[PDB]
Structures are given as C-alpha cells and as structure tokens.
Write a protein that binds this ligand. Structure first.
Ligand SMILES: CCCCCCCC/C=C\CCCCCCCC(=O)OC[C@H](COP(=O)(O)OCCN)OC(=O)CCCCCCC/C=C\CCCCCCCC
Ligand code: HEM
Ligand code: HEM
Ligand code: HEM
Ligand code: HEM
Ligand SMILES: CO/N=C(/C(=O)OC)c1ccccc1COc1cc(C)c(I)cc1C
Ligand SMILES: [Zn+2]
Lengths: 442, 271, 101, 49, 55, 422, 59, 54
C-alpha cells in the first residue's frame, strides 16, 4: 500500500571524502547494478575559445587512459559485460557504468581512471575531430533540438547558457590537446563530483574503493572552493530560422525559470502536468484530458507538443514546444498561449488532483532501474545538495492546490516578455508583439 | 437560424421606428398627436426618463425642434435598414434557406436562377397589383382623415389611433392602465420575438407535421387580428375587457402554450 | 388500457408525414446530436433515409403527396435512428457530467 | 551548422538596466513595464477626457 | 484564376454568389418570396422617399 | 516493515494463469499477456491484429471510449498494447492505491470490446500513420521483408497492416479474431506490485469468453526467399539469416551465445567492439563507417538467425561479405574457449539487467507464465546458459553456413550482393 | 518605487488597469479644467464679465 | 474554428480587414491618409446630421 511503500524505500547513504569528493548509494536486493561519476561540469563552465571541450572530452573519455589504452580499456570493459555510458550537458557531465554488483569495486577503478588519468592520445583526437564534426551535421537535423538550442541562444544571449553543448564548428576544428587537458584539469575535481551507485552494493564496500582510487588530496583551501558561476541574463526575445523547404515547423516559447533550489519548481511541474504532452499517436485522441491536447485533435493543431520545466542552478526555462504544419502554427500557438493563461486564471481542483496523480507516477517512473536511480542521485546531490526521497517529493506535491498553481504560474508567466524559437516554414507565427500580448487576459 | 432571426427582429424595430417618424412629417393632426401620445410614454420611466423626453423633443412639447430632427431621422433610418438587411442576408447565406418540410435540402437543391428569380418576380406582381389597386383607386382607404387637418396643439382629435400596422401594439399598450406597465407591454409585445428561438421544444422544425401547434399558431394569428381591431376602438366596455384578454392570450401563447404543446407534441410521437 | 396507443396512433396520422413517405425519424430536425447519429447509420439505412427525403422534397415542390396505398402505417414505421440517437445523447450526457467533477 | 549562429549585440538598443549580461532582468522587469504601462494608462485618461 | 467572369470578379462574385448560383431548396413555397419583396419594397420606399424629400 | 516476498502462480480450470509477485514498489503494473498476432492472420484478414492493437481505447460493454481514457488519466494511470507476430500484451501502470481502478478498464479492454462499426472506421486511417512513423526507421523496413522472404506463412506475415488492407478491415474481423484467439488457455494475467490473492480474485470472478484454445496457428513453414527494396538511400540496411532455433528449444542458448561471440549490441558509448568479432572483422574490410551485428529470433515453432548490416551504398558489398566469412571462420573452430567464457557473461549480464525495468521484469515473469506456466528461477537460467559447449557454438555457426539462407535489404543496392553470391 | 508599485497594484490586471483610467480620468478632468480655466482667465485679467461684474451687482 | 473571430461571419470582417490584415512592414506616413479619409467621413456624416437636425 502506497502511503507505506514510500517509507520502506532504503534511505540513500552519503559520506564525503576528506578530499572534497562525495559518495552516495541506494542498496537493493539486486544482482546487477550501476555506478558513475556525476561531475558538476558543463558547456556553461566554458568560454568563447574553448566552447566544446566538455564534449570533445566526453568523446575521448573512452578511447583509453594512460594506465590502459583503447584496446585494453575497451576489451577490459566489454569482456566483463559492463556498460560504460555517459553524457554532458550545459551544467552537468556524467560517466557511469552498468554491471554485476560483483564488479562493484573493480568498476569504480575504471570510472576513476577515466576522469583523472584520461589518455588523450593526440593521434586519437584528430580522429575524434572529424567525428564530432559529423555528429553536428547529423544533430543539425533534429529540429526538436535545433530549436531548444536556438531557444537558449536568445533566451540567454550574451551569457554562458546561450551556448551549444557541442560547441562551435570552429572550436571543434581547432581545440587542442592543450585545452582538452585544461578542461579536465580545471573542471574534473573531487568536490565538484559525486560517486553514485544503486543496486546490490553496501555503502561501506563502495565508499572504500573510492577512498582507494579517489585519493587525490587537496592542500590549500582553494581546491576546496566550489567556483560560483556568473549568472546569465534572461532576455525576452525571439530568433526565427526560416526555411520553407522544411516539411514541418517547430516552435519553442518560454519564460525565465526559478532555478533548482526554489520549491515552486514543484508547482510549476504540477502545472506542466495539466497541459501535458501529445503526438499524433496518442490513442486517447479527442478524449484526452489535456485541453491543449484535445483541441490539437479537434482541429488538427499540431503533430506534437510538450511542456517543459528545464531547471538550472540559478535559472531555468519554462514553456512549451510544438511541431506543426505551416498553416496551423498560428491557431496552435494561440491555443497554447491560451491554456498557459487559463493556468494563471481559472485552474480547477480537478485539474490539479489529476496533475498530481500524474506527476507522482512520472517521478516514480524516473526511478525505474539502477541507471535511472544513480542519475537522480548523481543529480539530486550535485544540484539540490541533499537527496530528495519519493516520500518527500510526494508530500511536497500533495500540498499543492488549484489556488497555489494560479499563483505560481501567474508569478512566472503572466505579463512577462518571453523567448521565442521558430524554425522552418514559419510564415504564420509572426509578430512578437502579438505573441507578447498573449501573455495576459483569458 | 438565430442570427438571421435576430437581425430580422432589429430590421423590424428599425422599420417601425422609421415609419413612426415619417408619420410626423406631414404635420397633420394625427401626425402631431401620434407624436405626443407616444413620445409621452417615455416619461413613465423612473427618473432617467422625465428628461429623456424633453431631450427627445428638443423642447417641452412636440414642436419644430422635433419635426426637423424627426425628418433627419426619417432620412437616415431607411439606409440603416438597407445596411442591416445586408447583414441579414449574410447570416442567411451561412446556412441557406430553410424549407417547408424542415429536413436537409442538400439532397436536392436548385439554382436561385431562374427558378426563384422567376418565382420571385411573379410573387412581386401578385402583390404589387393590390398595392397599386388600392393606391390608385382608393388612396385614403387606409389613412385616417384627421391628418388632413393641419396640426393644432390646442385641439385634440376625437380619436387618436395609428395606422393599422401599429394597431395591434396600440391595443396592448392601452390594455394596461398604468403608463409604465403599458409601455413595457408594448415593448415586450414586440421585443418578445427575440425569445422565440429559446422557446422551441419540438423535435421537428416546421409545424407542417404538427397539427396541434398549427391551430395554436392560427389561434395566435387571429389573436393579432383581434388586437388590431381592439386597437381601432375606444376605451369603453366591452372593448377594454376584450382588450386585456387578447393581449393576455397573446403573451400566454408565445410564452406557455407554444413551448408546452410542443413538448406534449413530442411525446405523442413517442420521442 | 389502450388509451395511449390509440392516441399515439392518432397523432401519428394527424401529423401525416407518412403521406410523404417519411418515417418518424426522417422528419427529425438535425441538431448536433441527430447530426452525429446519422453519420453512424449503416450505409444502406442511411442511403434509404436519403432518397425518402429527396423524394419527399420533390413532392412538396410539386405540391403533391403519395397515393393513399403508399403512405406509411403507424406500425410499419421503422425507428431506425432512435437507438443510434439515445446512445449519442447518453455518451454526451456522460462526458458533460464528467467535466464538472 | 546551427551551432555557428548567435544572437547579435543589441547594446545600442537595450534599456539601461537589462544591459549587463550578469544582472537578473527579473528585478528591473516591473519597472520597465510599469513605465510604458503608465504612458499608456495615461494616454487613456487623456483620450477619455 | 477562373474561366467565366462572375466567379473571378470581386464584384460579380457578389452579384452572383447571392442571387444566381445561390443554392436554394427545390421545395420552398410562396412564403419565401417575402424576402425579396421586403427588399424590393425598401428599394422603392427609399426612392419615392427621396423624390418627396426633394420637395 | 515489508521485504522479500515470493512469486505465486496459480492456474484455474479454464487454463488461465496468474503470475503474481509483490515487490513493494510504490507502483503496480498489471498486464494481460496473450498468444495472438500476425501469425494467426489469414490472407483474407491481414492486419486485423494491428488494428486491434490500436483499437484498445475503443468502447467496451463496460467502459466508454471516454471513461477509459479519462478514467485512467484521472489517476495518473496509463495503458498500452505490445505485440509480436505471436504475442500480445495489454498492460496498465499506476500508483498502488489505484490498482483495481486501473483494472476495470484493463479487464474490459481485452475481454469485452464492442468494436462499434463507426468507431472502427473512425480509426482505420490511424494505421496509415502509425505505420508511417514506424517505417521512419529502415531498421523496421528490412525486418518486415525479412520475415516475408524467410517464410511462406504465419510468421511470414507483416507486423504492420499492408497498405491495401488499410480501411478494409471489418468490425466482424476484429471480433472473430478476438473470440477466436483471446481465450483463457492462451491468456495469462501477470502483474507486479500486488498480492497474488487479489490478482487472482479478479481473474476468476471477472474473466469470461475464454475457456478454450481457440484457433490453431498455421504451422510456420520455411521458404528461403530474398526481397530487395531499391530506394536510393545513402545507407543500405541488409540482414541475412537462416532458420535458427525456437523458443524453449535446447539449441537456443547456442545462438544466443554464438550471437554474443559474434557481437550484438555495444557497451562503450561511441566506441568499438574489440570483443565483437563480427564488428571487428567487418572493420578490417570496410573503410567508411557502418554497423553490423548478430540477429537472433526465437519463435514458438521456429526461429531466425544471422547478421545485419548498415553501410555506405558502395561498401554494402564488401561489408556483407566480410560479415559472412567472419561467420564461417567462427563456424570452423575459430572460436576460442575463452571467447565463449566471456560471451557467456555478456549474456548473463544483459539478461540480468533487463529485469530492472518493470517493463522488462513484468515481461519476463509473463512470457514464461504463458509458454510454460513456470518461472525458471534465475540460477536455473544460469545453470542452463553456461551449460553450453564450444561445440554447441561452432556447430550452431555451421547450421547457418549450410542451411538455406534468405536475405532482405533496403537502400541503394547497386553494390549490394545477391543471396546466391555468398 | 512607484513604477514598481504601480505595475503591481495598477497596470497589472487589465481590470485594475481600466479601473484606474476611470478614476484617474475623473481626477484629471476635475483638475485639468481648473488649471486651464484659471490660466485662460489670468491671460484676460479684468476683461471678462466675471471681473467687471461687481460694478452693477447689488439688489 | 478555435478562437471566435475567424468562425464568426461578422468578427471575421472586423478582424480580417483591421487586425490580422497582412500589411507591408515598410509603408510610410503616406499610407495613413487611407484611414484618416475614412475617419474623416465617419465624422462629417455625424456632424452633418447633428446640423441637419437644426
Ligand atoms: C402583427 C400584425 C397582425 C395583423 C394581421 C395581418 C393580416 C392577416 C391576414 C390573414 C392571413 C390568412 C392567410 C391564409 C393562409 C392559409 C394557408 O395557406 O394555411 C395552410 C398552410 C399550411 O402549410 P404546410 O403545412 O407547410 O403545407 C404542406 C404542403 N401542402 O399554412 C401556411 O401557408 C404557413 C403559414 C404562414 C402564414 C402566416 C401569415 C400571418 C401573419 C401574421 C404575423 C405573425 C407573426 C408574429 C408577429 C409579431 C409582431
Ligand atoms: C428589414 C427587412 C427584411 C428584409 C428586406 C428581409 C429579407 C429576407 C430575405 C431576402 C430572405 C431570404 C428569402 C426569404 O424571405 O425566405 C430572408 C430570410 C429570413 N428573414 Fe428576413 N428580411 C427582413 C426582415 C426580417 C424580419 C423582421 C425577420 C423576423 C424577426 C426576418 C427573418 C428572416 C428569417 C428567419 C429568414 C430565414 C428564411 C428561411 O426560413 O429560409 N427577416 N429575409
Ligand atoms: C424605411 C422606408 C420608409 C418608410 C417605411 C417610410 C414611411 C413614411 C411614412 C410612414 C410617411 C408618412 C406618409 C404619409 O403622409 O402618409 C413618410 C413620409 C415621408 N417620407 Fe418616408 N419612408 C421611408 C423612407 C423615406 C426615405 C428614405 C425618405 C427620404 C430619405 C423619406 C422621406 C419622406 C418624406 C419627405 C415624407 C414626408 C412627406 C409625405 O408624407 O409624403 N421616406 N414616409
Ligand atoms: C472616398 C475616400 C477614400 C477613402 C476613405 C479611401 C480609403 C483608403 C484606404 C483606407 C486605403 C488603404 C490604406 C492607404 O491609404 O494606403 C486606400 C488605399 C488606396 N486608395 Fe483610397 N480612399 C479614398 C479615396 C481614394 C481616391 C480618391 C483615390 C484616388 C483616385 C484612392 C486611391 C487609392 C489607392 C490607389 C489605394 C492603394 C494604396 C496603396 O498604394 O497601398 N483612394 N484608400
Ligand atoms: C461627404 C461629407 C460631407 C461633406 C464633404 C460636407 C460638406 C459640407 C459643406 C461643403 C457644407 C457648407 C458648410 C459651410 O457653410 O461652410 C456643409 C453644410 C451642411 N452639411 Fe454637410 N457635408 C458632409 C456631410 C453631411 C451630412 C452627411 C449631412 C447630413 C445628412 C450634412 C448636412 C449639412 C448641413 C445641415 C449643412 C448646412 C448648414 C451648415 O452649413 O452648417 N452634411 N456640409
Ligand atoms: C407619430 O405618430 N405616428 C403614428 C403612426 O401610426 O405612424 C405611422 C401614430 C399615430 C396615432 C397614434 C399613435 C401613433 C404611433 O403609435 C405607435 C408607434 C409605434 C412606432 C409603435 I412600435 C406602436 C404604436 C402604438
Ligand atoms: Zn378619424
């Protein structure tokens, strides 16, 4: 029974290493497991000349280490059935491995090696250069993203956040064994990292292995100092990339967010739960509960749309993104901005109750497996400081009510200048002004 | 056809007002007095009316200031009618003509021309005839004579009564003894139309297949004839009582019978 | 107590849409509901309903009716739409009350 | 590619406040609007009269 | 745009699609003539109306 | 305070199965597994299964297309269908308290659908699209033709309704299909997050129309064909396989392992599979990028096995051949006793990691509880896995080189080789 | 911080906004006229009957 | 229609002619005379009557 199953979930253990780094884990009766290093690094922490290092690095983090080059490293990992994966976004890089709880320790070693003693054989770089260079030309055709990026690039413009996590085309072309080093150098440091694990592992056993390979001690106090980032200025504006030869069109609209810390992020989510999401394959179709959805069917408004609450350390982007035919863009937008409004004005207790029960399931969902748990933990700590339990989250959610939503949405949505990203055959979206006004009264 | 209807009603209202002013122009006894009797009703409204009137007259009684402004008004309104008429026909062309049977015509529609353009012109002649016939052989058959006597504010005509087309209303106005009430009754006597739509209960549209409603309908029509007649008569028994009744039944039908007999009708079809 | 039936049958002949060869449900005014039901009608039943009307109109335009032998009869009138209808009204009535919740 | 595109410099046109790419526009927001919205509001009373 | 000249003319397209190609039931009776009559009626009053007003 | 419960699994007279398992997760996940699919479809009713897959949200004798969606959404619930040529599963996820509530619909959806003529037609066009997004991945383009050019029946049928039959499926076809295949003996009411007792009470007092084994699936015959879709693409997907083993079969694990030994799926983001011989061998022959793996299918009464490539139009040829040889070299003692040992774990792992996701774990519990009515414990599938000899493998690799092969490709094949040229 | 405070209690909702214009205009009129009339009269000191009235007024 | 100024046979004329109307982005002040001319009429007519009434 719910109310109870939430407590039985084993508390997550956290103990920091006297050298800055931290360790956390959730032990379960599972044979398999997952562990990884969640570095608080990103494209935000980059700059004009280096833009793209954290990615170029992410690329060379597996082509060997000094201790054991490409062949052996790869061989060593495949041969034990482990899965070494990882990513790297604007404010969070992460390298993690999936394997039998048996390899628990031996694993850490690997992780540890990669971050610290990464090979960086200059012969492999000139090879990884042409690679990224392709990943761009290929990622350069995923409008859903091309959009979000452009969205960021204007939402923040003239700030670190307005940068692609893949970096410029130039940077990729000229980055050097040098700078690549520098990034890892300056960025991959103990305090700014979290060793996370969940599966059939005892905090003890784990914590130790870390104490064994994560031994690098800090002398001064500066090596203990977590660099605070210069905030990014939000700018109500728009960027329109027109190409009428594009089959469909993408549109992203957003407002400045509150940042990881702020509690309202929860509310904001409950909200997004109400406007939900949709793609032409949802089966509920005209009967769906999200008013925006339904209409999108009753009028063929779009192809897909989604509400998102991206949260960064000190900021965030709140909004929605839809894809649609060149001739329904308008109606669609209209309806969307509309719904948004209703949020601040006539949201009901039924809409919330539903949104809450949806959110609950959505949160629980993010923790389906080991990989998804360490991700959360790697994140929770790094971002929130502590680690929030489903029992906590849940309560924080049960506390929200209609009245509460209308107030928070009103706070971050009502009469605010927003950021707009239009890409494709967008001759119908037109005029910020109009789009602006759609930010009040409804 | 809600819109097409409401625009209609307005059109009527405008037409009514329009004549009303046009009548004053010849400034004959009836011209004058009809003005005074009617305009004087407005003074029954509380507070905000005793003024509305002296404003409307441009003075303290129907006089030149009025005549002149009425003429201007009579020049104007027709155009405003033409205008709305355009909107009327538009809301119509949004659905097309309703047909005597009350069932989808899509299964068989014909081009206005020459079918209805031809029908229309015949219809025209079949009317224009008596119109000319009366207007060429019996000019004043309709018009009261007191209007051949130059208006004189000092002397009042024996009987003050409008043109037939305002009679029915006149009769209802005069049925209620209380300027204010009678005014309301007059207003509502015509305003009521707007309600009609919201007072349809039959599962069918036209009365073609609804015998009951039909007679209630003809009872209503005749009910107007009576009101008309009652309006061309003075305020003495029996008239008065007959008067109040007729009006009483007029509203009763459009308000209670019609919608009720409609429902009841539906159940006999077993719907 | 055949009072009712006697009446219903009366009124039925009273309204006399049979004279046109119509079915009770043909004469139904096409409000949103009816509009829906009709769309659900199986090809045949719908195509039949159609002709009947197109026939009826042609009569009315002609100012004629069907010969007494062809009129429809109270008990032979097939309420082909009622069922489809009721359900629509049921389906809607559901939705409606659920959006209040 | 799209990674090669950046929103130009609007230095010349930005408002005195939202000019420093390190300052939360969200503080000066209410001001910036409250002004124009006053101009407007005023213009209405001007018309009204 | 179009072949004939009463569907591609922003004016004849209004003297046509409202009085000539206009879709009309095939069974409307005499009680539908009052429409045009009412119109024609207006067309006339206004005319005689002016003619009088001129004197 | 909870803990470690045990998996109960009952069977009633009608032959229905109930695989339980309370794992005290804050979220339950019930599901109806069934023996249905494009396998029991006749040329006269093709795709009728596909449609049935989307027909899930349609009205039932119990719930309305409306209450089904709104009712389920109302509790942050969810429901969906998953099927292969031979297996169909209707499952619904939700918070624990909202189980029985999410059940009403599940039960109804799979046992009492009304398949209203209109609702059906006002749905047909969806297949036109559902099948459009799908075929956005050529990966599914060759896979359809593969099975086609591999068989002559049942398993030879497409998983996505052919175009011609779009909109020509009937309400009756749906029904008959269901009345015929969705019958107790072929059905299993699995489900996590709940006490076996409940998931039981439901199943019995509630489930009807069953009692039987319904129609029999036409035994799957092998063809050995070769289909080619020339379509001018930079890439050329191509898969060449041979009759592999079948589910439950002994000769299964062999391939499953011969698969890993050959290399199927990566574990190093953006890397190479030094462990994977196929990949490796392929790299030594081709110049430009690509991807090749071990294709292994295990069906009720048959299976498929071979490789699957992807490669620049001009390198298609060399990339396919290279794949072949690297299959022969394995078919002839070119398999180290060590290779086996490693692949024996890469498999144990993969298996083990699949059962973390309730979507993967529920599945597992079900599959068996349907094609056996037994849940072969974890250490049993372990004793049964490594119990494979270097021989079982090499021989598994031969069965392939000698048996009749059937290819299937889709790209600018101007350089892609014909099945007979291998 | 008037502009802030204004944008909050006044120019925010389109309701209180309007409500302000109304009341606001009221004040504007009531006091725009005064100023205007005063100004006008001043520019015509002793020419208006408002001034030279005292010379014939007394019952 | 979703909103109510494109599906209303009237607002569809108060809109598609004065609000959603596609206008060049570079027309100058010599384009204002259009509306002025209009407004002008709206006024003359009004003052015109007001006088005619006396
Ligand atoms: C208000 C002012 C009232 C002043 C009085 C106006 C003048 C009164 C003149 C009397 C009118 C008598 C007309 C005789 C018509 C007889 C007739 O044809 O009846 C049968 C026939 C049956 O039709 P179906 O069932 O469709 O036939 C199927 C196909 N064969 O009825 C009809 O033609 C339809 C009825 C339309 C005529 C209505 C005219 C009466 C006018 C009064 C205005 C009333 C409305 C309210 C006004 C509010 C202000
Ligand atoms: C200002 C004068 C008016 C003019 C010149 C006018 C003209 C027309 C015309 C040309 C038609 C189409 C043909 C027909 O008569 O059926 C029409 C239809 C209609 N008018 Fe009027 N009309 C007028 C007044 C009114 C009034 C006062 C009403 C009633 C409140 C009204 C109600 C209707 C209705 C409901 C239709 C629909 C006809 C149908 O059932 O097909 N109209 N009108
Ligand atoms: C809406 C259409 C019209 C109606 C219903 C109408 C009606 C009348 C009426 C009721 C009279 C009294 C007639 C009498 O003495 O018996 C009249 C007179 C007159 N009307 Fe109109 N009228 C209309 C249009 C016009 C128009 C458009 C004008 C010119 C703009 C006009 C100018 C006059 C004049 C000059 C008189 C006064 C002299 C006279 O009585 O002959 N009328 N009108
Ligand atoms: C009866 C008074 C008139 C009114 C109220 C009127 C109104 C307008 C309006 C509202 C416009 C659109 C905006 C603009 O001004 O560009 C327009 C455009 C135009 N009008 Fe007039 N107009 C009038 C008389 C005329 C006259 C006498 C001419 C010259 C023979 C004329 C020629 C045009 C032209 C050529 C345009 C196109 C404007 C463009 O180039 O975009 N108009 N008018
Ligand atoms: C097309 C718009 C109009 C124009 C261009 C116009 C122009 C004028 C002109 C040229 C005069 C002479 C003014 C003077 O004495 O210096 C005048 C006078 C007058 N107009 Fe109009 N007019 C217009 C509309 C109207 C209308 C619509 C009416 C009422 C239907 C009207 C009624 C009068 C009256 C009563 C006078 C005579 C008394 C006077 O001069 O003040 N006018 N108008
Ligand atoms: C100026 O008086 N005009 C009259 C007339 O009949 O004009 C055609 C007239 C003459 C004598 C008595 C009453 C009137 C006006 O009466 C009206 C006028 C209107 C509008 C309505 I509704 C209802 C009534 C009863
Ligand atoms: Zn007399």
């Amino acid at each position: 029974t719910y109310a109870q199953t939430l407590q039985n979930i084993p508390e997550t253990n956290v103990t920091t290493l006297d050298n800055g780094l931290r360790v956390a884990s959730e032990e379960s009766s599972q044979p398999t497991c997952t562990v990884g290093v969640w570095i608080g690094a990103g494209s935000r922490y980059e700059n004009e000349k280096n833009n793209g290092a954290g990615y170029f690095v992410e690329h060379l983090a597996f082509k060997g280490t000094k201790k054991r080059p490409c062949a052996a490293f790869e061989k060593e990992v495949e041969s034990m059935g482990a899965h070494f994966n990882g990513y790297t976004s604007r404010e969070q890089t992460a390298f993690y491995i999936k394997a039998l709880s048996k390899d628990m320790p031996k694993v850490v070693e690997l992780l540890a090696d990669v971050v610290q003693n990464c090979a960086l054989e200059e012969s492999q770089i000139e090879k990884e250069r042409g690679v990224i260079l392709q990943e761009l030309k290929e990622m350069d055709n995923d409008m859903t993203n091309v959009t979000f990026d452009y969205l960021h690039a204007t939402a923040f413009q003239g700030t670190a956040l307005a940068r692609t996590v893949e970096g410029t085309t130039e940077n990729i072309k000229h980055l050097t064994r040098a700078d690549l080093a520098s990034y890892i150098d300056t960025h991959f440091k103990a305090p700014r990292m979290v060793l996370a694990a969940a599966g059939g592992i005892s905090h003890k056993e784990l914590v130790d292995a870390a104490r064994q390979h994560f031994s690098g001690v800090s002398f001064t106090y500066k090596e203990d100092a977590v660099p605070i980032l210069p905030r990014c200025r939000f700018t109500g504006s728009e960027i329109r990339a027109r190409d009428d030869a594009l089959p469909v069109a993408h549109v992203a609209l957003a407002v400045e967010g509150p940042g990881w810390a702020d509690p309202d992020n929860v509310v904001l989510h409950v909200a997004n739960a109400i406007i939900g999401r949709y793609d032409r394959t949802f089966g509920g179709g005209k009967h769906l509960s999200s008013r925006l959805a339904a209409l999108a069917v009753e009028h063929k408004l779009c192809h897909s749309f989604q509400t998102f609450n991206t949260s960064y350390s000190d900021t965030g982007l709140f909004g929605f993104h839809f894809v649609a035919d060149p001739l329904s863009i308008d109606d669609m937008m209209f309806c969307a901005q509309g719904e948004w409004m209703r949020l601040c004005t006539s949201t009901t207790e039924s809409e919330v109750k539903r949104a809450k029960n949806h959110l609950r399931s959505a949160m629980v969902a993010q923790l389906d497996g080991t990989t998804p748990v360490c991700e959360t933990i790697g994140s929770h700590l790094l971002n929130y400081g502590r680690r929030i339990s489903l029992e906590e989250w849940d309560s924080r959610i049960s506390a929200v009510d209609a009245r509460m939503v209308r107030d928070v949405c009103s706070k971050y949505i009502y009469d605010k200048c927003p950021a707009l990203a239009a890409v494709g055959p967008i001759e119908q979206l037109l005029d910020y002004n109009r789009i602006r006004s759609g930010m009040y009264w409804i | 056809y809600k819109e097409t209807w409401n625009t209609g009603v307005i059109l009527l209202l405008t037409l009514m007002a329009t004549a009303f002013v046009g009548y004053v122009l010849p400034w004959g006894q009836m011209s004058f007095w009809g003005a005074t009797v009617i305009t004087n009703l407005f003074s029954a409204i509380p507070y905000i009316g005793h003024t509305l009137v002296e404003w409307a007259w441009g003075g303290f009684s129907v006089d030149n200031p009025t005549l002149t402004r009425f003429f201007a008004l009579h020049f104007l309104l027709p155009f405003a009618i033409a205008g709305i008429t355009i909107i009327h026909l538009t809301f119509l062309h949004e659905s097309g003509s309703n047909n005597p049977l009350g069932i989808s015509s899509d299964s068989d529609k014909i081009p206005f021309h020459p079918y209805y353009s031809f029908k229309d012109i015949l219809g025209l002649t079949l009317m224009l005839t008596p119109f000319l016939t009366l207007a060429l052989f019996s000019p004043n058959l309709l018009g009261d004579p007191e209007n051949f006597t130059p208006a004189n504010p000092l002397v009042t005509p024996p009987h003050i009564k409008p043109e037939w087309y305002f009679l029915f209303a006149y009769a209802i106005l005069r049925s209620i003894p209380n300027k204010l009430g009678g005014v309301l009754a007059l207003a509502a006597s015509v305003l009521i139309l707007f309600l009609i739509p919201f007072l349809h209960k039959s599962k069918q549209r036209t009365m073609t297949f609804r015998p009951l409603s039909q007679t209630l309908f003809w009872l209503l029509v005749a009910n107007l004839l009576i009101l008309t007649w009652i309006g061309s008569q003075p305020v003495e028994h029996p008239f008065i009582i007959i008067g109040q009744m007729a009006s009483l039944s007029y509203f009763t039908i459009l308000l209670i019978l019609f919608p009720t007999i409609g429902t009841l009708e539906n159940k006999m079809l077993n719907y | 107590g055949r009072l009712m039936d006697r009446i219903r049958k009366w009124y039925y002949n009273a309204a006399g849409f049979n004279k046109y060869g119509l079915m009770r449900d043909d004469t139904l005014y096409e409000d949103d509901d009816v509009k829906e039901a009709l769309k659900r009608l199986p090809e045949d039943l719908y195509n039949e309903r159609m002709f009947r009307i197109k026939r009826a109109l042609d009569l009315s335009l002609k100012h004629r009716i069907l010969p007494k032998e062809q009129w429809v009869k109270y008990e032979e009138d097939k309420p082909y739409l009622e069922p489809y209808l009721k359900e629509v009204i049921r389906e809607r009535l559901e939705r409606e009350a659920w959006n209040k919740k | 590619v799209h990674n090669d595109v950046t929103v130009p410099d609007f230095s010349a046109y930005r408002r005195e406040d939202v000019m420093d790419a390190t300052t939360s526009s969200q503080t000066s927001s209410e001001d910036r609007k409250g002004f124009s919205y006053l101009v407007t509001a005023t213009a209405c009373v001007a018309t009204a009269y | 745009m179009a072949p004939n000249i009463r569907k591609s003319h922003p004016l004849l397209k209004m003297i046509n699609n409202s009085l000539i190609d206009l879709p009309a039931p095939s069974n409307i009776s005499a009680w539908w003539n009052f429409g045009s009559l009412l119109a024609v009626c207006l067309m006339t009053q206004i005319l005689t109306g002016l003619l009088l007003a001129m004197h | 305070c909870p803990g470690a419960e045990d998996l109960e699994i009952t069977k009633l007279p009608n032959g229905l199965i109930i695989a339980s398992l309370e794992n005290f997760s804050p979220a339950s996940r019930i599901g109806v597994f069934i023996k249905a699919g494009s396998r029991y479809e006749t040329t006269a009713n093709l795709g009728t299964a596909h449609l049935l897959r989307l027909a899930s949200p349609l009205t039932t004798k119990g719930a309305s297309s409306f209450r089904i969606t709104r009712g389920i959404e109302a509790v942050g619930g969810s429901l969906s269908v998953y099927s292969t040529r031979e297996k169909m599963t209707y499952c619904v996820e939700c918070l624990r308290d909202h189980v029985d509530t999410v059940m009403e619909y599940l039960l109804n959806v799979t046992t009492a659908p009304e398949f209203r003529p209109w609702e059906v037609t006002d749905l047909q066009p969806q297949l036109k699209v559902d099948k459009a997004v799908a075929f956005q991945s050529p990966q599914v383009g060759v896979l359809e033709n593969l099975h086609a050019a591999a068989y002559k029946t049942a398993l030879a049928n497409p998983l996505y309704c052919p175009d011609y039959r779009i909109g020509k499926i009937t309400s009756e076809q749906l029904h008959h299909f269901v009345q015929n295949n969705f019958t107790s003996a072929r059905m299993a009411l699995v489900g996590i997050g709940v006490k076996h007792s409940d998931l039981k009470q439901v199943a019995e007092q509630f489930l009807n129309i069953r009692s039987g084994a319904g129609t029999s699936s036409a035994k799957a015959t092998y063809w050995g064909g070769e289909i080619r879709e020339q379509n001018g693409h930079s890439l050329v997907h191509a898969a060449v396989v041979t009759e592999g083993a079948a589910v439950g079969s002994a000769e299964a694990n062999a391939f499953s392992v011969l698969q890993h030994v050959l290399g199927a799926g990566p574990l190093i983001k953006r890397g190479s599979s030094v462990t994977s011989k196929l990949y490796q061998g392929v790299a030594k022959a081709t110049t430009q990028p690509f991807d090749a793996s071990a294709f292994n299918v295990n069906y009720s009464d048959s299976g498929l096995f071979g490789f699957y490539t992807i490669s620049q139009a001009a390198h298609a040829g060399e990339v396919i051949r290279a794949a072949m040889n690297q299959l022969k070299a394995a078919a002839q003692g070119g398999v180290t006793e060590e290779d086996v040992t490693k692949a024996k774990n890469q498999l144990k792992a993969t298996y083990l990691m699949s059962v973390e996701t309730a979507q993967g774990l529920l599945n597992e519990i079900g599959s068996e509880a349907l094609l056996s009515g037994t849940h072969t414990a974890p250490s049993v599938v372990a004793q049964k896995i490594d119990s494979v000899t270097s021989a079982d493998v090499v021989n598994a690799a031969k069965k392939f080189v000698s048996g009749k092969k059937s290819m299937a490709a889709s790209g600018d094949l101007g350089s892609t080789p014909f099945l007979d040229e291998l | 911080a008037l502009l802030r405070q204004a944008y909050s209690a006044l120019f925010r909702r389109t309701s209180t906004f309007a409500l302000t214009v109304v009341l606001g205009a009221v004040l504007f009129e009531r006091a725009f006229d005064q100023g205007a009339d005063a100004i006008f009269e001043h520019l015509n000191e002793g020419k208006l009957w408002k001034h030279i009235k005292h010379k014939y007024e007394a019952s």
